[PDB]
């Protein structure tokens, strides 16, 4: 049960996945499952994709009815900020772990 | 602004701090600030300490009116689980980062 711990990082993982190429909810979910986040279900990814759309971080396209997501410039900018935040937070938590 | 990302890990960082020796809210807060989580304020630590008390993870002592916190056996058990969760979640997020 990693939900609470993973919650605050999950939007970024999704942005990272969408960055690699045009994709869609089902495939994002399976990619997160394949990574080892087996408890991540489609509805969790759906909700994230909605948040990313309202923040205007992704370009959308109805293709052959499915929405295809890729990153726009804001999205790439935002993904960069996420990883800088991740690197900082994780390094400091590991500095703390390092003493037990 | 690391609050959302740090939120799901902050209770564990506190448990880790209390584990090292008997301590109290102000000192825990300053320890987190000194680590680099400068936006962590006392009220955030207070709220966490309350959660840890209701989960019965800490022994409390009114000493010379301040409450002194140390870990009981449940608390040590729980801290161990937190770090196992942290190691898993962070390793998988870093596996993902490793491809950009």
Residue numbers in the entry:
A (entry chain A), B (entry chain A): 3 to 66, 72 to 107
What does the paper behind this entry write?
The bcPadR1 and bcPadR2 subunits contain a typical wHTH DNA-binding domain, consisting of helices α1, α2, the DNA recognition helix α3 and strands β1 and β2 (together forming the wing), and a dimerization domain, including the C-terminal helix α4. The closed dimer conformation and inaccessibility of the conserved tryptophan residues of the bcPadR proteins are incompatible with a drug-binding mechanism as observed in LmrR.
In addition, we report the crystal structure of a bcPadR1 homolog from B. cereus strain ATCC 10987, the product of gene locus BCE3449, which we named bcPadR2. This latter protein was selected for structural characterization because its gene is positioned in the vicinity of two genes encoding a putative antibiotic ABC efflux pump (gene loci BCE3447 and BCE3446). The proximity of these genes, similar as in the lmrR-lmrCD locus, could indicate that bcPadR2 regulates the expression of the ABC efflux pump, perhaps following a similar ligand binding and induction mechanism as LmrR. The gene encoding bcPadR2 (locus BCE3449 in B. cereus ATCC 10987) lies downstream from two genes, BCE3447 and BCE3446, which encode a putative ABC-efflux pump. DNA analysis indicates that the BCE3449 and BCE3447-BCE3346 genes do not share a common promoter, and are separated by another gene, BCE3448, which encodes a soluble protein of unknown function. Similarly, bcPadR2 was crystallized in space group P43212, with one protein molecule per asymmetric unit and a solvent content of 42%. In addition, residues 67–71 in the β-wing of bcPadR2 were found to be disordered and therefore left out from the model. Likewise, the bcPadR2 dimer can be fitted to the DNA-bound complexes of RTP and BlaI with RMSD values of 2.9 Å (for 179 common Cα atoms) and 3.4 Å (for 155 common Cα atoms).
